Design an enzyme around this catalytic site. Structure first.
Site, mmCIF file in Angstrom:
data_model
loop_
_atom_site.group_PDB
_atom_site.id
_atom_site.type_symbol
_atom_site.label_atom_id
_atom_site.label_comp_id
_atom_site.label_asym_id
_atom_site.label_seq_id
_atom_site.Cartn_x
_atom_site.Cartn_y
_atom_site.Cartn_z
ATOM 1 N N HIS A 113 -11.946 -4.110 -9.768
ATOM 2 C CA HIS A 113 -12.297 -3.314 -8.575
ATOM 3 C C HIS A 113 -13.573 -2.666 -8.688
ATOM 4 O O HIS A 113 -14.024 -2.002 -9.768
ATOM 5 C CB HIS A 113 -11.341 -2.040 -8.509
ATOM 6 C CG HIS A 113 -9.979 -2.286 -8.564
ATOM 7 N ND1 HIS A 113 -9.101 -2.130 -7.331
ATOM 8 C CD2 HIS A 113 -8.949 -2.561 -9.347
ATOM 9 C CE1 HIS A 113 -7.779 -2.363 -7.610
ATOM 10 N NE2 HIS A 113 -7.714 -2.561 -8.601
ATOM 11 N N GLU B 67 -13.175 0.222 -11.793
ATOM 12 C CA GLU B 67 -11.760 -0.003 -12.435
ATOM 13 C C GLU B 67 -11.498 -1.458 -12.762
ATOM 14 O O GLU B 67 -11.361 -2.301 -11.808
ATOM 15 C CB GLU B 67 -10.808 0.446 -11.793
ATOM 16 C CG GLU B 67 -9.464 0.343 -12.441
ATOM 17 C CD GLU B 67 -8.039 0.859 -11.497
ATOM 18 O OE1 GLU B 67 -8.309 1.608 -10.577
ATOM 19 O OE2 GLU B 67 -6.931 0.838 -11.934
ATOM 20 N N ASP C 130 -8.747 -3.632 -14.049
ATOM 21 C CA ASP C 130 -7.201 -3.842 -14.396
ATOM 22 C C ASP C 130 -7.164 -5.257 -15.219
ATOM 23 O O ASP C 130 -6.667 -6.120 -14.451
ATOM 24 C CB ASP C 130 -6.429 -3.835 -13.253
ATOM 25 C CG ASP C 130 -6.333 -2.237 -12.521
ATOM 26 O OD1 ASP C 130 -6.574 -1.439 -13.413
ATOM 27 O OD2 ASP C 130 -6.749 -2.414 -11.366
ATOM 28 N N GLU D 240 -1.794 -5.406 -15.404
ATOM 29 C CA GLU D 240 -0.876 -4.669 -14.686
ATOM 30 C C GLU D 240 0.548 -5.722 -14.842
ATOM 31 O O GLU D 240 0.308 -6.699 -14.010
ATOM 32 C CB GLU D 240 -1.368 -4.265 -13.507
ATOM 33 C CG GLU D 240 -2.375 -3.020 -13.551
ATOM 34 C CD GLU D 240 -2.758 -2.674 -12.110
ATOM 35 O OE1 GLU D 240 -3.444 -3.302 -11.313
ATOM 36 O OE2 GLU D 240 -2.171 -1.797 -11.679
HETATM 37 O O1 LIG Z 1 -2.370 0.917 -3.786
HETATM 38 C C1 LIG Z 1 -1.453 -0.115 -4.150
HETATM 39 C C2 LIG Z 1 -2.057 -1.100 -4.990
HETATM 40 O O2 LIG Z 1 -2.739 -2.087 -4.048
HETATM 41 C C3 LIG Z 1 -3.263 -3.069 -4.535
HETATM 42 O O3 LIG Z 1 -3.727 -4.086 -3.371
HETATM 43 C C4 LIG Z 1 -2.854 -4.711 -2.759
HETATM 44 C C5 LIG Z 1 -2.787 -4.138 -1.432
HETATM 45 O O4 LIG Z 1 -2.432 -2.861 -1.271
HETATM 46 C C6 LIG Z 1 -2.486 -5.083 -0.324
HETATM 47 O O5 LIG Z 1 -2.616 -4.523 0.853
HETATM 48 C C7 LIG Z 1 -2.861 -6.556 -0.447
HETATM 49 O O6 LIG Z 1 -2.393 -7.237 0.398
HETATM 50 O O7 LIG Z 1 -2.712 -6.735 -1.774
HETATM 51 C C8 LIG Z 1 -3.507 -6.247 -2.875
HETATM 52 C C9 LIG Z 1 -3.347 -6.776 -3.975
HETATM 53 O O8 LIG Z 1 -1.732 -6.534 -4.486
HETATM 54 C C10 LIG Z 1 -4.208 -2.829 -5.707
HETATM 55 O O9 LIG Z 1 -4.587 -4.070 -6.445
HETATM 56 C C11 LIG Z 1 -3.559 -2.083 -6.687
HETATM 57 O O10 LIG Z 1 -4.479 -1.531 -7.566
HETATM 58 C C12 LIG Z 1 -2.757 -0.850 -6.025
HETATM 59 O O11 LIG Z 1 -2.154 -0.062 -6.994
#
Ligand SMILES: OC[C@H]1O[C@@H](O[C@H]2[C@H](O)[C@@H](O)[C@H](O)O[C@@H]2CO)[C@H](O)[C@@H](O)[C@@H]1O
Ligand SMILES: *[C@@H]1O[C@H](CO)[C@@H](O)[C@H](O)[C@H]1NC(C)=O
Ligand SMILES: *[C@@H]1O[C@H](CO)[C@@H](O)[C@H](O)[C@H]1NC(C)=O
Ligand SMILES: *[C@H]1O[C@H](CO)[C@@H](O)[C@H](O)[C@@H]1O
Ligand SMILES: [Mg+2]
Ligand SMILES: [Mg+2]
Length: 435
Positions: free
Chosen positions: A225, A209, A211, A214
């Site tokens: 990702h 993925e 992104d 967002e």
């Molecule tokens: O699942 C929610 C959201 O997670 C995002 O990654 C976060 C993660 O949850 C957190 O533990 C970390 O500290 O930060 C990252 C980045 O914000 C992820 O990037 C999203 O795609 C997802 O929707």
């Protein structure tokens, strides 16, 4: 899933541009299609629902295969039901639409023709679009992104999938979502359980993925990702990993990504209301996919254009994390300094994204609220909400830790919307210019 015949499926038009190295562009007349999960799903012999609310009709859907044989996805009233309007070069998605029923959000895909998604391989190219996020408060996410969905929606090797791309079938992403009603030509009724923070089925739909975007008016993130297998794979329950699993990192995809959010990277003056990239007005978002000398992705750059001024991405100011782009060095440093598990690297990092582009990426444009984490990962003064903002990586925006609860914002921000426009693709520096 079958093709429903009770309501015509007419894909709204959306034109986008392909540009040459010299900045000359030609138009492509594409169309958009609504994701299958938002559609009416009914029996092939009439109007009886196979699913509604959050439960399946178990007579029509006693197992995953029989359900797919018996159930048809029907046409969508894009504007009237889903608040989706596409005209010329512009796509508008409304957050809440009060038709006969209340609809929240949408996910759409760009099509090449009525039965095929458009695919993109952006290696050595850039993707550019204009966006209006002024109507997106805390808790909302206007996302524009790419996933290597099958161009035909899976029909070629899925006998019980007739609906395909024409009805927005085939979604997968790096969260391995289990809330999908159909995955790889079967229903997901087996193991289905209602869940307040989404229901969830027995299987999930995994892939890489990208992104690209967002964002809301407060914060924005750019996040590739990785995945072990870049195209769709089907996972089993908690082994899926991702958002709806007891062990988030136990699967074959990278659910976190290597993100660049200017605010999270220490520049709080760069993106937002009244800031350098001023979210009170429209702006252009440029994303460039640079390679090494072997044609493998090694850098993602970002520029903005607003008021005719070209704005480079802000520098990361976090001690130990330098630069303004996504590179090998940045990703390694950021995960080490923030203390986040480097699932990005574990599942193939830049090579994975290179292979995703080679497979062909489908463009997704969506508007959503977040029933899992209230979008706090994007825009909160702290995520997790109990962590210290003095710790690098905790702060991501200016929104309170109590912000973005769906039941709150679906009322208080019912008029929210996003507009994507003027999509352009081409060689590096072909799609934009300015002072
Ligand atoms: O699942 C929610 C959201 O997670 C995002 O990654 C976060 C993660 O949850 C957190 O533990 C970390 O500290 O930060 C990252 C980045 O914000 C992820 O990037 C999203 O795609 C997802 O929707
Ligand atoms: C489920 O589908 C069957 C077969 O069409 C139908 O007889 C029944 O009314 C449906 N059940 C519900 C609760 O709608
Ligand atoms: C593209 O433009 C950027 C910003 O001015 C510049 O840094 C880069 O060298 C340019 N690349 C090419 C291939 O012209
Ligand atoms: C359903 O329950 C979940 C927790 O399991 C909450 O996050 C949500 O707000 C809803 O109450
Ligand atoms: Mg199944
Ligand atoms: Mg504003």
């Amino acid at each position: 899933q079958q093709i429903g015949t009770l309501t015509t499926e007419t894909h709204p038009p959306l034109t986008w541009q392909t540009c040459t190295s010299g900045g000359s562009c030609t138009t492509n007349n594409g169309k958009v299609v609504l994701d299958a999960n938002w559609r009416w799903l009914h029996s092939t012999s009439g109007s009886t629902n196979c699913y509604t609310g959050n439960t399946w009709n178990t007579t029509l859907c006693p197992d995953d295969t029989t359900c797919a044989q018996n159930c048809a996805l029907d046409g969508a009233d894009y504007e009237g039901t889903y608040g989706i309007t596409a005209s010329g070069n512009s796509l508008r998605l409304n957050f809440v639409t009060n038709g006969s029923q209340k609809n929240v959000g949408s996910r759409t895909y760009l099509m090449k023709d009525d039965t095929h998604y458009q695919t993109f391989n952006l290696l050595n190219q850039e993707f550019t679009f204009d966006v209006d996020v002024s109507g997106l408060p805390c808790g909302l996410n206007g996302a524009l992104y790419m996933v290597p969905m099958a161009a035909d929606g899976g029909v070629s090797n899925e006998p019980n999938n007739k609906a395909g791309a024409q009805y927005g079938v085939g979604y997968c992403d790096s969260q391995c979502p289990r809330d999908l009603k159909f995955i790889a030509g079967s229903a997901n009724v087996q193991g289905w359980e209602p869940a307040s923070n989404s229901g969830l089925g027995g299987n999930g739909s995994c892939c890489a993925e990208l992104d690209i975007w967002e964002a809301n008016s407060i914060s924005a993130a750019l996040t590739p990702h990785s995945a072990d297998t870049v195209t769709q794979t089907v996972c089993n329950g908690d082994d899926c990993g991702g958002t709806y699993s007891n062990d988030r990192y136990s699967g074959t995809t990278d659910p976190d990504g290597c993100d660049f959010n200017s605010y999270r990277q220490g520049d709080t003056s760069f993106y937002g209301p009244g800031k350098t990239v001023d979210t009170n007005s429209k702006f252009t978002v440029v994303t460039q996919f640079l390679t090494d000398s072997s044609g493998n992705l090694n850098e993602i750059k970002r520029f903005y254009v607003q008021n005719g001024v070209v704005i480079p991405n802000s520098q990361s100011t976090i001690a130990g994390i330098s630069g303004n782009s996504i590179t090998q060095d940045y990703c390694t440093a950021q995960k080490q300094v923030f203390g986040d598990t480097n699932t990005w690297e574990d599942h193939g990092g830049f090579q994975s994204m290179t292979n995703a582009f080679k497979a062909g990426m489908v463009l997704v444009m969506s508007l959503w609220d977040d029933y899992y984490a209230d979008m706090l990962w994007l825009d909160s003064v702290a995520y997790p909400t109990d962590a210290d903002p003095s710790t690098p990586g905790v702060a991501r925006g200016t929104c309170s830790t109590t912000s973005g609860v769906p039941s709150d914002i679906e009322s208080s921000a019912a008029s929210a919307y996003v507009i994507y426009s003027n999509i352009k693709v081409g060689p590096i520096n072909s799609t934009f210019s300015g002072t």
